Amino acid sequence: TLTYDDIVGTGLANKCPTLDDTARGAYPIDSSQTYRIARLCLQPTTFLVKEEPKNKRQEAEFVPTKLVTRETTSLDQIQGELKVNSDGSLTFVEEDGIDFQPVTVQMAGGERIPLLFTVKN
């Protein structure tokens, strides 16, 4: 278990927690108890931008991009209700957290694409 000073400057602060290869279990849901997501973390590893072609009869593809705003991209400390629905499905309702990050990526040739990477609401 690491402390801030073990972490600071390493880039680890922009990475979500992981689980081992042995974590292939199952978490029981008790339909009478209420549940919440105490922490949701989302760590982007690829940004792709759909090309905007002239012909408009070719299917446009998503192409790779270069991140230029450094290790500032992850969503974390997100929390909310985890409902158990009548049909046994679960619904997560986001309520709060660091749930947006501005991001600028660059396409081949230099065009910069800013976006608000988010899962708000």
Partner 1 sequence: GLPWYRVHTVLINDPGRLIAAHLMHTALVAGWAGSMALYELATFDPSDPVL
Ligand X SMILES: CCCCCCCS[C@@H]1O[C@H](CO)[C@@H](O)[C@H](O)[C@H]1O
Which spans of this chain sit near partner 1 (rule: CB under 8 A)?
Answer: 53-55, 109
Q: Identify whether the C-beta of residue 51 lies closer than 8 Å to the C-beta of residue 69.
A: no
3-state secondary structure of 7: helix
Partner interacting with residue 110 (select from partner 1, ligand X, none; CB below 5-8 Å by kind): ligand X
> Which amino acid appears at position 30 of this protein?
D
CA nearest to 114, candidates 86, 29, 104, 89: 104
Enumerate residues 17-36 that contact ligand X by CB under 6 A: none
Enumerate residues 100-119 that contact ligand X by CB under 6 A: 109-110
Nearest distance from C-beta of residue 115 to ligand X, angstroms: 19
Binding site for ligand X (CB under 6 A): 109-110
